[PDB]
Design an enzyme around this catalytic site. Structure first.
Site, mmCIF file in Angstrom:
data_model
loop_
_atom_site.group_PDB
_atom_site.id
_atom_site.type_symbol
_atom_site.label_atom_id
_atom_site.label_comp_id
_atom_site.label_asym_id
_atom_site.label_seq_id
_atom_site.Cartn_x
_atom_site.Cartn_y
_atom_site.Cartn_z
ATOM 1 N N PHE A 61 0.846 -1.190 0.000
ATOM 2 C CA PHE A 61 0.000 0.000 0.000
ATOM 3 C C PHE A 61 0.883 1.241 0.000
ATOM 4 C CE2 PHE A 61 -4.383 -1.460 1.646
ATOM 5 C CZ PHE A 61 -4.327 -2.571 0.808
ATOM 6 N N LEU A 85 2.784 -12.934 3.342
ATOM 7 C CA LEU A 85 4.144 -12.736 3.817
ATOM 8 C C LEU A 85 4.504 -11.269 3.690
ATOM 9 C CD1 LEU A 85 6.144 -15.620 2.065
ATOM 10 C CD2 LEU A 85 5.424 -15.654 4.440
ATOM 11 N N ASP A 86 5.179 -10.742 4.704
ATOM 12 C CA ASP A 86 5.769 -9.423 4.569
ATOM 13 C C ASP A 86 6.838 -9.480 3.485
ATOM 14 O OD1 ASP A 86 4.255 -7.965 6.296
ATOM 15 O OD2 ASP A 86 5.727 -7.878 7.923
ATOM 16 N N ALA A 87 6.949 -8.398 2.712
ATOM 17 C CA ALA A 87 7.869 -8.416 1.581
ATOM 18 C C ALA A 87 9.311 -8.596 2.029
ATOM 19 C CB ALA A 87 7.714 -7.140 0.751
ATOM 20 N N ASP A 88 9.601 -8.395 3.313
ATOM 21 C CA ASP A 88 10.934 -8.645 3.841
ATOM 22 C C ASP A 88 11.102 -10.061 4.390
ATOM 23 O OD1 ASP A 88 9.670 -8.764 6.287
ATOM 24 O OD2 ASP A 88 10.765 -7.104 7.187
ATOM 25 N N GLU A 138 2.378 -12.056 15.685
ATOM 26 C CA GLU A 138 2.568 -10.995 14.713
ATOM 27 C C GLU A 138 1.698 -11.292 13.501
ATOM 28 O OE1 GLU A 138 3.319 -8.220 14.460
ATOM 29 O OE2 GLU A 138 4.699 -7.737 16.109
ATOM 30 N N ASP A 147 11.427 -11.263 8.693
ATOM 31 C CA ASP A 147 11.507 -9.860 9.117
ATOM 32 C C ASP A 147 12.910 -9.277 8.929
ATOM 33 O OD1 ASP A 147 10.663 -7.367 10.112
ATOM 34 O OD2 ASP A 147 10.904 -7.939 12.203
ATOM 35 N N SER A 163 13.638 -6.582 7.526
ATOM 36 C CA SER A 163 13.683 -5.133 7.689
ATOM 37 C C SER A 163 14.294 -4.758 9.028
ATOM 38 C CB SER A 163 12.281 -4.531 7.580
ATOM 39 O OG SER A 163 11.475 -4.935 8.679
ATOM 40 N N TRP A 184 8.125 1.870 7.055
ATOM 41 C CA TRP A 184 7.092 2.825 7.444
ATOM 42 C C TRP A 184 7.228 3.382 8.858
ATOM 43 C CZ3 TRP A 184 3.784 1.823 11.525
ATOM 44 C CH2 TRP A 184 3.793 0.512 12.009
HETATM 45 O O1 LIG Z 1 4.403 1.943 2.893
HETATM 46 C C1 LIG Z 1 4.239 0.769 3.261
HETATM 47 C C2 LIG Z 1 4.993 0.096 4.267
HETATM 48 C C3 LIG Z 1 4.717 -1.188 4.564
HETATM 49 N N1 LIG Z 1 3.717 -1.886 3.927
HETATM 50 C C4 LIG Z 1 3.440 -3.295 4.254
HETATM 51 O O2 LIG Z 1 3.919 -3.569 5.562
HETATM 52 C C5 LIG Z 1 4.777 -4.729 5.525
HETATM 53 C C6 LIG Z 1 5.787 -4.657 6.642
HETATM 54 O O3 LIG Z 1 6.872 -3.790 6.241
HETATM 55 P P1 LIG Z 1 8.193 -3.666 7.108
HETATM 56 O O4 LIG Z 1 8.714 -5.041 7.309
HETATM 57 O O5 LIG Z 1 9.157 -2.649 6.493
HETATM 58 O O6 LIG Z 1 7.707 -3.048 8.494
HETATM 59 P P2 LIG Z 1 7.928 -3.669 9.939
HETATM 60 O O7 LIG Z 1 8.468 -5.038 9.884
HETATM 61 O O8 LIG Z 1 8.851 -2.652 10.611
HETATM 62 O O9 LIG Z 1 6.534 -3.588 10.571
HETATM 63 C C7 LIG Z 1 5.347 -4.716 4.116
HETATM 64 O O10 LIG Z 1 5.789 -6.008 3.716
HETATM 65 C C8 LIG Z 1 4.132 -4.279 3.299
HETATM 66 O O11 LIG Z 1 3.275 -5.389 3.069
HETATM 67 C C9 LIG Z 1 2.954 -1.302 2.939
HETATM 68 O O12 LIG Z 1 2.063 -1.894 2.349
HETATM 69 N N2 LIG Z 1 3.259 0.002 2.664
HETATM 70 C C1 LIG Z 2 7.377 -9.033 11.084
HETATM 71 C C2 LIG Z 2 5.977 -8.531 11.426
HETATM 72 O O1 LIG Z 2 5.235 -9.183 12.163
HETATM 73 N N1 LIG Z 2 5.601 -7.328 10.866
HETATM 74 C C3 LIG Z 2 4.310 -6.687 11.111
HETATM 75 C C4 LIG Z 2 3.815 -5.817 9.933
HETATM 76 O O2 LIG Z 2 3.525 -6.632 8.793
HETATM 77 C C5 LIG Z 2 2.556 -5.041 10.355
HETATM 78 O O3 LIG Z 2 2.073 -4.281 9.251
HETATM 79 C C6 LIG Z 2 2.907 -4.170 11.567
HETATM 80 C C7 LIG Z 2 1.752 -3.285 12.048
HETATM 81 O O4 LIG Z 2 0.715 -4.055 12.673
HETATM 82 O O5 LIG Z 2 3.217 -5.058 12.644
HETATM 83 C C8 LIG Z 2 4.390 -5.852 12.419
HETATM 84 O O6 LIG Z 2 5.545 -5.052 12.361
HETATM 85 MN MN LIG Z 3 9.707 -6.111 8.746
#
Ligand SMILES: O=c1ccn([C@@H]2O[C@H](COP(=O)(O)OP(=O)(O)O)[C@@H](O)[C@H]2O)c(=O)[nH]1
Ligand SMILES: CC(=O)N[C@@H]1[C@@H](O)[C@H](O)[C@@H](CO)O[C@@H]1O
Ligand SMILES: [Mn+2]
Length: 309
Positions: free
Chosen positions: A27, A199-202, A232, A299, A301, A308
């Site tokens: 998104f 799956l998270d893209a990471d 999570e 994860d 990232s 984000w």
């Molecule tokens: O601008 C954004 C940022 C994140 N995501 C979604 O949120 C997931 C989690 O992203 P990230 O691992 O960077 O965040 P974190 O693990 O810190 O929550 C990504 O795979 C995307 O599916 C998205 O749709 N738009």
């Molecule tokens: C590795 C993992 O569980 N990431 C999630 C992410 O996908 C989600 O968007 C965020 C906000 O709820 O929470 C966690 O960071």
């Molecule tokens: Mn992540």
């Protein structure tokens, strides 16, 4: 196939076969940060998510790979996405706005009014007077500006994780059906009522996933930080659409005035469904429900920076 036990109930390990589609989500709340004809999915040196999706598509050649996207993309960014689909047969880009979520919706005024009635039935001496006033203010705000505000429309406004967390749950409720709803042709072995592996893209693939075996056909990511573990939503695997655990989470969203898509729609739904009460052991539930695979580097990232946060 076997089974696993939690809280005195034995749950069969149900299979998610190797044609269960993978789902990535992107998104974009500011797509103009990408080239007008560039693929509007982050692909920086720090967050190479487009490349990660490509690589998972190359590993899982035979598996359908959904990419749920949303945002105000330019026409050329949409063509870029289309060009992506033609480069990788198994990648299927689904526009969130092309999906109908109204069967999961509810009016905020009905949610608020339902809670007001319950709380007001408690006499003034024991009722949560603060909460009642917050709900009344919320309802009053809705009726003054957008009396037909609903869960969906309300989250549509709240750009950021809260909104894409919300639609992630709703898309997984559609399961494989969402690919059919969106009109993606040629999805091998994809069946109505079928499941999905988000799956998270990471979450990096390093090999094929093969067939999964999950308690009642569901599992989620369990993250570990310091000495802690938490449910999570970075990974959500279901063997079918309308999984009763995600449906319970939606039900919680429908009855709670300030339902969180993550805390309630995922963690809350799972815990009620499996009766992981506040009295039960959370660490025991996490181990029971954890999504585990040696071929996912999870994860990543956290190794660099969130996209984000
Ligand atoms: O601008 C954004 C940022 C994140 N995501 C979604 O949120 C997931 C989690 O992203 P990230 O691992 O960077 O965040 P974190 O693990 O810190 O929550 C990504 O795979 C995307 O599916 C998205 O749709 N738009
Ligand atoms: C590795 C993992 O569980 N990431 C999630 C992410 O996908 C989600 O968007 C965020 C906000 O709820 O929470 C966690 O960071
Ligand atoms: Mn992540």
């Amino acid at each position: 196939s076997g089974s696993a036990n939690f809280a005195g109930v034995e749950y069969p390990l149900l299979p998610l076969d190797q044609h269960t589609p993978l789902l990535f989500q992107w998104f974009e709340r500011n797509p103009s940060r990408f080239g007008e004809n560039q693929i509007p999915i982050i692909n920086t040196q720090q967050n190479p998510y487009l490349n990660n999706i490509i690589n998972a598509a190359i590993i899982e050649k035979e598996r359908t790979i959904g990419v749920l996207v949303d945002g105000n993309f330019s026409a050329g960014q949409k063509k870029a996405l289309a060009k992506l689909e033609k480069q990788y047969e198994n990648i299927k880009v689904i526009y969130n706005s092309d999906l109908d979520y109204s069967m999961y919706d509810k009016k905020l005024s009905d949610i608020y009014l339902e809670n007001i009635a319950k709380i007001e039935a408690q006499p003034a001496n024991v009722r949560d007077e603060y909460l009642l006033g917050e709900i009344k203010k919320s309802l009053n705000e809705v009726l003054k500006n957008n009396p037909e505000e609903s869960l969906v429309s309300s989250h549509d406004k709240r750009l950021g994780h809260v909104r894409f967390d919300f639609y992630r749950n709703l898309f997984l409720l559609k399961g494989s059906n969402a690919f059919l709803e969106a009109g993606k042709h040629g999805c091998h072995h994809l069946q109505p009522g079928g499941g999905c592996i988000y799956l998270d893209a990471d979450m990096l693939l390093t090999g094929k996933l093969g067939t999964l075996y999950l308690p009642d056909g569901i599992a989620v990511h369990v993250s570990r930080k310091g000495n802690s573990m938490s449910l999570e939503n970075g990974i959500i695997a279901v063997n079918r659409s309308e999984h009763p655990a995600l449906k319970k989470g939606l039900e919680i969203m429908h009855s709670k005035p300030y339902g969180d898509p993550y805390i309630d729609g995922v963690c809350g739904g799972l815990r009620h469904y499996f009766n992981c009460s506040i009295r039960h052991n959370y660490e025991e539930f996490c181990n029971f429900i954890e999504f585990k695979h040696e071929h996912i580097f999870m994860d990543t990232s956290s190794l660099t920076i969130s996209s984000w946060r």
